[PDB]
Every structure is written in structure tokens, then in C-alpha cells.
Design a protein around this nucleic acid. Sequence first.
DNA 1: CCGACCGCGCATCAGC
DNA 2: GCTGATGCGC
DNA 3: GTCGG
Length: 325
Amino acid sequence: TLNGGITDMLTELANFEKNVSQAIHKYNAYRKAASVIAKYPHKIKSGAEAKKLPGVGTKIAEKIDEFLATGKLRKLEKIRQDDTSSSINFLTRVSGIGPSAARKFVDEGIKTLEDLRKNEDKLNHHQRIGLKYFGDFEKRIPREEMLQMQDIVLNEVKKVDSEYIATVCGSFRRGAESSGDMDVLLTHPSFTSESTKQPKLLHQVVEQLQKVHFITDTLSKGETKFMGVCQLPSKNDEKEYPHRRIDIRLIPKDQYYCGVLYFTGSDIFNKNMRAHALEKGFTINEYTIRPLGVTVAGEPLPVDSEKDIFDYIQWKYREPKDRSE
DNA sequence: CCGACCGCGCATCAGC
DNA sequence: GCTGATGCGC
DNA sequence: GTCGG
Ligand SMILES: Nc1nc2c(ncn2[C@H]2C[C@H](O)[C@@H](COP(=O)(O)CP(=O)(O)OP(=O)(O)O)O2)c(=O)[nH]1
Ligand SMILES: [Mg+2]
Ligand SMILES: [Mg+2]
Ligand code: NA
């Protein structure tokens, strides 16, 4: 972390803008700047130097000059000292509680973990589970446990139908030594962009995983996306493993490459890549890459590899391990 | 200067 | 109920 | 908050 100090600062500012100011573009501006600085291979010596980077403008440059000269940022010192901002920032740490709900809770006099616990009936289902596992969800997942989890999911999916393919993406596929959660891409020959020849495809998999007590709770669930909680089994006399977040995304089998590009991320990498696509006259989602007409997105382009997608927008291919922005 | 900023699934709500 | 908008999250 | 045109 050559510039850990600066990137932390920008990240703290990003979170402030998202959670407190509810300014989504400032939030992303800060994340963009943090990311570009995080990959810059020199220890930054000044704001002017940082300003040379795409995404770092005049304001951030000044903040970087303040931070290098003093080791802190007055703007942040004050924010940390503001009861309301501190409260809202904390509440948003609960899964299911965002900027709006957080601010609403604070108004109603609900602003601590203790408050939340005694006002459970004021929470929706997602929020209840978020609170339930508040502690566990901030723990990291060692890659070693991710491997065990991978083994379980893949074998259980196989048990439901040998035709399922399950791929663990997210930070895990990018080779991270630890992950915030597990992200599982699912495909089945019966679900393509052309038809759904079989119902309950995602359901049957969730069911099986619940049946074996791997999945423990559900945050949300539709036909193509599951968001919930899972837990590795422990051994006799062993303390239990923390509960873990798990996301499962069912994607049409014929759109696997756009799907896996999406789910592999990182989020900022996708954002940057999609932004570039627009500049090259394409739009990219998790299903397709389409050209943009003189006016509207056109018809989907043939894609037979992740690299094919990079080719269209004229980027040299980047391995998953190099997409951690 | 200033419009535009990546793209979308599920849960909830308002209005009809 | 439906549709569209918003919140929250990937 | 930043930036392309
Ligand atoms: N285009 C796009 N893709 C996204 C976004 N957010 C997530 N993805 C894609 C890319 C992302 O890789 C994948 C999973 O997102 P997470 O599981 O929440 C964060 P991960 O990268 O997995 O790292 P972890 O902190 O869990 O160790 O969804 C977004 O805002 N936009
Ligand atoms: Mg993840
Ligand atoms: Mg995830
Ligand atoms: Na939250």
C-alpha cells in the first residue's frame, strides 16, 4: 500500500458522500480517484503529481496536499466529530440499511446497535438478518475457507443436476487471499436467452443448499438472483465458523462470458470498462455487448470468450487477477 | 461551461 | 392487481 | 467531484 493513507482518506470521503450527503456521483468520483491512485506505482509526493491521474481533479489535489503536509484532513476530522454523520455512517454498516433508512432511524432516535436490537419490529426482513449477523459479516473469509465453501456448493449443485455449472467469481476468481463474501455464477442448459425450458432452476439449488444446512438465511430471492447467508460445518468440540454472505446469480447459458466478466469484477473495473465501452460506442451489461447507433443500443454482438469483449472496445485482455481495481 | 457519469435484480411504495 | 419510482445491493 | 468537447 504505497499510498494507503491517501486512498483511505478518499474512501472515507466517498462513504461520507454516499451515506450522509446521499450524493451518488461524488461517492463514485471519490472511489474512482481512490482506485486510480491505488494502482499508481509511485509513492505520491504532491497533489499536482496526483492530479495528472484521470479522476483526480483540483479539489482532490488540494486535499492530497493537506494530507501529505499534516497527515490528516480537517474536513474529515469534523465529520468524525459530528454525531449525526457518525450515527448514519454506523447504521449503514448493517446490510439492508442504506443512506435513507439510516437517516430515518436516526430521526426516530434509533442510532446504536443496542437501539436496533430493541426495535427489531421496525426492521424489514433483510435488515433483521443484517443485524442478526452484524458481527460475522464484517469478518473476512480466508481463501482456505472459500475453497471449502466452493467444494460444498459445486458438489451440492452437481447433486441436483449434473448439467448445472457453478462458477465462483467475485474477489475469489481474481485470486484474492481473502473475500468479503462468496459470489456464485450459475448456468443450466435449460435457461438461455432464447427460452426457459425449466422452472425453479435457481430455487432447486437454494433448496438443496438449505437442505444440507449450508444456506442458513435468505435476504432476497427471485428467479435469477439469490442473496443470503451460509455457514461451513464445523467439527466436534470446534467453535463454529462465522456466518457468511453468499450471492448466487443464474445467467443464460449462452451469455456466460458477459456474465462471468460481470461477476468477476471488481465493481470499479466493470464501471471503468463499461465507461470505456460507451466511449468506443458500445454498451456492456452482464448479458450482452451491443453497439450504440447514431441515435439506442443495437442487437447483441457475437461473443465466444471474455477476450472477445475486450477486443470490441479495443482493450488488451486482462486476467481476473489484474482486475482488482 | 455543463451534461453525463455502468448497468441491473429484488423489495418496497405510491398511485391508479 | 399493475406500473413506475425509489432504496439497497451485486 | 471530474471531465470531454
Ligand atoms: N457493473 C457492476 N458490477 C458490480 C457492481 N458491484 C458488484 N459488481 C460485480 C463485480 C463484483 O466482482 C461482483 C461481486 O460483487 P461483491 O461480492 O459485492 C464485491 P467483490 O468484488 O466480489 O469483492 P469482495 O469484497 O466480496 O471480496 O459483482 C456494480 O456496482 N457495477
Ligand atoms: Mg464478492
Ligand atoms: Mg457479493
Ligand atoms: Na448497509
